Amino acid sequence: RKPPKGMFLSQEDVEAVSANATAATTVLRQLDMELVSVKRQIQNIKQTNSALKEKLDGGIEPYRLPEVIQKCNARWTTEEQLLAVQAIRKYGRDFQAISDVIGNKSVVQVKNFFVNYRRRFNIDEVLQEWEAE
Amino acid sequence: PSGVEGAAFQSRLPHDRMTSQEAACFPDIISGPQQTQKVFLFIRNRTLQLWLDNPKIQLTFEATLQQLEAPYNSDTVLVHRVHSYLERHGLINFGIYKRIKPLPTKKTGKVIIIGSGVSGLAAARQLQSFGMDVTLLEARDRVGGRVATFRKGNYVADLGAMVVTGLGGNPMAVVSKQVNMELAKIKQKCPLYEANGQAVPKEKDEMVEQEFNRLLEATSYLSHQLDFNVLNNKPVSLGQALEVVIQLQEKHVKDEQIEHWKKIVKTQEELKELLNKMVNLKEKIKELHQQYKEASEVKPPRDITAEFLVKSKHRDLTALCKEYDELAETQGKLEEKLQELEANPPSDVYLSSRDRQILDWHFANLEFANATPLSTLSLKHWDQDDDFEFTGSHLTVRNGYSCVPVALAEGLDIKLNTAVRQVRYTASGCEVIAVNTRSTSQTFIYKCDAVLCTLPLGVLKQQPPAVQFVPPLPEWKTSAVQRMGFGNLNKVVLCFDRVFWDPSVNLFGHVGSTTASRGELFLFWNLYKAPILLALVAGEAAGIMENISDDVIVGRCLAILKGIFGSSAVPQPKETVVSRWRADPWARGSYSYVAAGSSGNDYDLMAQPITPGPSIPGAPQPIPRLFFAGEHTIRNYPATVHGALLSGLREAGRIADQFLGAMYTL
Numbered sequence: 001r002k003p004p005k006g007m008f009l010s011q012e013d014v015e016a017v018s019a020n021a022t023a024a025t026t027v028l029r030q031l032d033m034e035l036v037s038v039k040r041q042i043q044n045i046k047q048t049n050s051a052l053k054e055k056l057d058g059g060i061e062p063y064r065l066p067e068v069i070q071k072c073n074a075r076w077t078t079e080e081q082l083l084a085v086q087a088i089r090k091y092g093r094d095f096q097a098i099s100d101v102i103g104n105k106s107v108v109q110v111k112n113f114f115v116n117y118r119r120r121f122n123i124d125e126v127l128q129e130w131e132a133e
Numbered sequence: 134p135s136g137v138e139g140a141a142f143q144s145r146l147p148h149d150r151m152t153s154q155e156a157a158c159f160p161d162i163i164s165g166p167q168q169t170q171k172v173f174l175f176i177r178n179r180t181l182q183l184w185l186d187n188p189k190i191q192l193t194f195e196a197t198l199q200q201l202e203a204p205y206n207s208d209t210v211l212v213h214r215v216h217s218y219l220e221r222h223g224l225i226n227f228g229i230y231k232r233i234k235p236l237p238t239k240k241t242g243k244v245i246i247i248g249s250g251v252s253g254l255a256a257a258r259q260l261q262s263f264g265m266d267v268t269l270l271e272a273r274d275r276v277g278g279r280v281a282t283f284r285k286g287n288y289v290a291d292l293g294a295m296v297v298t299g300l301g302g303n304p305m306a307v308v309s310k311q312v313n314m315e316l317a318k319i320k321q322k323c324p325l326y327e328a329n330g331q332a333v334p335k336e337k338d339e340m341v342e343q344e345f346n347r348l349l350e351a352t353s354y355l356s357h358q359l360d361f362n363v364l365n366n367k368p369v370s371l372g373q374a375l376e377v378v379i380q381l382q383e384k385h386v387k388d389e390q391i392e393h394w395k396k397i398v399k400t401q402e403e404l405k406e407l408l409n410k411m412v413n414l415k416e417k418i419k420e421l422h423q424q425y426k427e428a429s430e431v432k433p434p435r436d437i438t439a440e441f442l443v444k445s446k447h448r449d450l451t452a453l454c455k456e457y458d459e460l461a462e463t464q465g466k467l468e469e470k471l472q473e474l475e476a477n478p479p480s481d482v483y484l485s486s487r488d489r490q491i492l493d494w495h496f497a498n499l500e501f502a503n504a505t506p507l508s509t510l511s512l513k514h515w516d517q518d519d520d521f522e523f524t525g526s527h528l529t530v531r532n533g534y535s536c537v538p539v540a541l542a543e544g545l546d547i548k549l550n551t552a553v554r555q556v557r558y559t560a561s562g563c564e565v566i567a568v569n570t571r572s573t574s575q576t577f578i579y580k581c582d583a584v585l586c587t588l589p590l591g592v593l594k595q596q597p598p599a600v601q602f603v604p605p606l607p608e609w610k611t612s613a614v615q616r617m618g619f620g621n622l623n624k625v626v627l628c629f630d631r632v633f634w635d636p637s638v639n640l641f642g643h644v645g646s647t648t649a650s651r652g653e654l655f656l657f658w659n660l661y662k663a664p665i666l667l668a669l670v671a672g673e674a675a676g677i678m679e680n681i682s683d684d685v686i687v688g689r690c691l692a693i694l695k696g697i698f699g700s701s702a703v704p705q706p707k708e709t710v711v712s713r714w715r716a717d718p719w720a721r722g723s724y725s726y727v728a729a730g731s732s733g734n735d736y737d738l739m740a741q742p743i744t745p746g747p748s749i750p751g752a753p754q755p756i757p758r759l760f761f762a763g764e765h766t767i768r769n770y771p772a773t774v775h776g777a778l779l780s781g782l783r784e785a786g787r788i789a790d791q792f793l794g795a796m797y798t799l
């Protein structure tokens with residue numbers, strides 16, 4: 001029903017190696033070249049990636065900023081409200097980004113802000129101008 | 134198996150079923166009721182047992198009936214029919230037994246037997262036993278033909294047949310009880326020794342052999358399952374198929390390497406895209422941090438937009454630092470997945486030059502077992518006779534195999550040094566013209582009712598012909614002679630003053646340097662009482678070494694032996710003999726094989742007797758006149774002594790039926 005296990009003998013392959021006298025040596029060379037072709041292509045990308053790896057040297061270490069650990073407040077200093085309006089102008093509905101900019105407001109308080117000061121800060125106009133970019 | 138059923142098995146018969154041959158003689162029984170069939174089968178099996186229990190004395194109908202029980206001993210015309218059938222076809226009372234009823238005083242019919250080989254001798258004994266006039270014509274100055282045994286001093290080595298291939302169902306098993314043969318078991322263990330002169334380690338040895346056996350099953354799979362048997366009209370040989378298989382295995386090994394390295398590039402290229410994204414991010418971060426720094430420079434107190442800028446840039450930077458860390462994460466996984474794939478490549482090569490050489494030894498062994506280049510063997514049929522393999526250990530005839538043909542020859546009219554030149558068979562009888570091998574112009578004429586031709590196939594093959602058939606053999610016969618393969622294998626006998634090899638080891642291989650010389654002195658036998666090493670020359674090498682002198686051959690023999698056992702442990706041989714079977718004019722080869730484009734069926738054609746045309750036109754269809762026995766005529770046991778022996782028994786049965794009449798068929 002089947003070959004010995006690990007032996008490869010498909011109807012298709014048998015015909016290919018026996019198609020002529022050296023169709024054997026032909027197909028075995030196509031693969032020998034296909035291997036060498038891929039093998040140098042490996043060292044080519046290995047080379048390219050080595051150079052890219054070195055341009056990433058030092059990582060992003062002299063670029064990280066220490067952590068701002070501040071407790072989440074409920075009241076809106078005019079400061080925070082004004083930070084918000086500008087954040088909306090720059091982020092739209094990215095409540096997470098707006099929350100991170102204001103620093104001490106939860107993602108929901110940000111969403112609350114949207115409905116509370118909706119009329120007074122023309123958030124409709126502010127949002128429609130964020131979309132204009 | 135044992136009892137009455139062991140006897141059936143030991144006689145190569147199904148214990149619980151009537152054979153085609155039995156159906157022919159007992160059509161009343163086999164077409165009849167199931168009850169009688171089992172009575173028949175028992176009587177047959179029982180009589181066989183009786184003969185087998187004591188093959189040194191003749192088993193008569195009386196003795197048989199005497200030891201039978203009710204209800205079996207009740208019907209005596211059945212018992213008589215059965216016993217007579219068995220005796221006729223040499224299943225009982227064959228070989229060398231003491232007769233009880235001294236031979237019929239006057240003979241009936243006259244048979245000329247060509248060749249006193251084992252098949253010849255076996256038939257002769259049967260026919261004489263049936264009360265016929267028998268004379269054998271042997272070209273050689275000795276009996277046995279291809280059973281040749283070198284003798285000198287105490288050195289005894291068979292240059293011909295040497296091995297009894299298991300006593301389980303072997304007719305030779307009976308012969309061995311009848312004749313003083315010294316049967317020594319052959320220990321299977323065989324250490325190989327590379328060209329260097331050092332042992333192949335068990336690691337290699339097993340992994341090559343298992344690959345070899347794997348390679349055979351593969352050819353078998355191409356033959357029966359993929360019907361790969363014709364290639365450009367030419368029948369596919371085994372060699373061809375073995376190559377095609379090895380190639381496909383070499384191909385696959387490359388297919389594997391390609392798709393493994395192809396995994397590396399696909400992954401190494403994911404790393405490329407990722408490193409590119411990473412450089413571009415350390416780029417935006419580099420510049421974004423610059424801007425944050427520039428906004429932190431604007432010292433407080435600042436207005437809200439300027440405060441917003443600081444806060445904004447800070448968020449935007451930590452947002453991009455999140456991404457870079459998630460990408461240095463991804464980088465870590467992909468960078469090790471590469472040391473993963475580079476740690477385990479697939480197999481480098483299918484087989485190395487050291488491997489392919491040891492594999493070649495295994496091919497040499499097959500070339501030896503078939504006495505022919507694997508490029509000649511039929512793919513589909515080369516092993517058609519495998520089912521009928523005997524059971525038990527293979528043995529050697531320690532006192533020399535010739536002890537058997539010589540033993541059979543006793544009591545027979547054998548004309549030695551008598552080369553048959555022409556066989557004439559006509560409606561009214563045959564005449565055989567032979568000459569004296571010594572002074573060849575001295576001629577002989579033999580008149581007979583029938584000729585039994587045991588001429589080797591290689592002889593029947595001779596072009597131009599050694600023996601002439603008048604009238605010519607019909608085309609169906611001569612095509613069988615052509616299609617069939619007659620192979621070649623040779624033996625080198627090395628006689629020393631001392632053992633210098635492992636005495637507990639019977640056989641040990643020598644691995645050749647090339648595919649071309651794979652059969653050249655590839656194997657050595659330590660089998661005999663005396664210090665003799667025997668060396669096989671098989672495959673393509675066999676046919677070429679026949680053109681090389683004995684010294685050149687013995688030189689290579691000693692060289693190989695030195696390489697293995699040390700250059701000074703191997704002395705100069707006292708006596709040496711080299712066989713040349715293909716050169717030998719009375720063999721023209723060693724034994725037959727199923728050539729590519731032949732089948733086991735050609736063996737049957739070989740066995741079919743010839744019936745001459747009528748003398749007077751309009752006169753009735755004549756008796757068959759020309760009959761054939763021999764190794765090359767027995768489909769189920771070709772190329773062997775037992776096979777020859779059996780074919781001789783076969784024809785003697787058929788000839789007796791033909792000329793003495795078969796009384797047991799009524």
Ligand SMILES: CCC(=N)C[C@@H](c1ccccc1)[C@]12Nc3cc(C)c(C)cc3N(C[C@H](O)[C@H](O)[C@H](O)COP(=O)(O)OP(=O)(O)OC[C@H]3O[C@@H](n4cnc5c(N)ncnc54)[C@H](O)[C@@H]3O)[C@@H]1NC(=O)NC2=O
Nearest residue numbers: 248250251252272278279294295296553719763764773774
């Ligand atoms: C398949 C397994 C196998 N190869 C068996 C051997 C073996 C090998 C490897 C491992 C285990 C076993 C095997 N080994 C072996 C080794 C070698 C080197 C050779 C050559 C043969 C064998 N065989 C084969 C048998 O020897 C052979 O089949 C019979 O002896 C032939 O008998 P006949 O048909 O009467 O012809 P035959 O014996 O040749 O008789 C014909 C006679 O006619 C004569 N003649 C020719 N022309 C004329 C003429 N014109 N006029 C008059 N007379 C003429 C001629 O001289 C001869 O006497 C072995 N068998 C076996 O059972 N065990 C073995 O070990």
